[PDB]
A = this chain, B = another copy of it.
């Protein structure tokens, strides 16, 4: 992580001291590496004005996996112009991107209202993560990027920060990730609760996640009969 080293600094400037308000901090203390996902894409294409067409521009990523996680559609990529730049997207994989010397940190910020009942938010699609692990293995890309999370807790007429949390997805035990199939097949968890005791290699994590994903896929399929078929059979 590029943020981990300066976590204390961020935590001390947030607690009490809005959404993406952390981006400001990062874009000032790491202005050299901080980007919104859409800003990184514009930056990458502006730097190579000689490369046109989506097929060519996609090659700019130099990584089938990163291409998969960060790129926009073919049309959007081909239609990309210097006078027609990319804008933020609700569907974007990451909130903030930190890249240095060909290594990437996909950072997601999660805001939690410590006043309401605890309800783990959608973290990332378990399916997208499976395709990611598959691409990591197929292309042997095990030392290219990390997916990390920064949690910001908040709470009379103003909403101030009370604490923060930071965790790395790849440091968590794969089989411990809760996949909520109904909730758009999303992994869900509060950052503060995310396990960080995995000790294996990045390759072992990917294989372990795939076994977990496949197993949960089987379990969900069977459970659908139990909850969506059995109780309604008597009406038909």
Contact = CB atoms under 8 A, between A and B. Distances in A.
Interface of A: 127, 130, 133-134, 137, 182-185, 206-207, 210-211, 213-214, 217-218, 220-222, 224-225, 228-229, 231-233, 235-236
A210 B236 contact: yes
Nearest to A234: B134
**What copy number does this chain have within its complex?**
2
The 10 closest A-B pairs by CB, nearest first: A217-B228, A221-B221, A211-B236, A221-B224, A210-B235, A217-B229, A210-B232, A214-B229, A210-B236, A214-B232
Given A182-B185, A184-B184, A232 B213 contact: yes
Contacts of A207: 235-236
B133 A235 contact: yes
23 contacts: A127-B182, A127-B228, A130-B228, A133-B235, A134-B231, A134-B235, A182-B184, A183-B184, A206-B235, A207-B235, A207-B236, A210-B235, A210-B236, A211-B236, A213-B232, A214-B228, A214-B232, A214-B236, A217-B225, A217-B228, A218-B224, A221-B221, A224-B224
Contacts of A183: 184
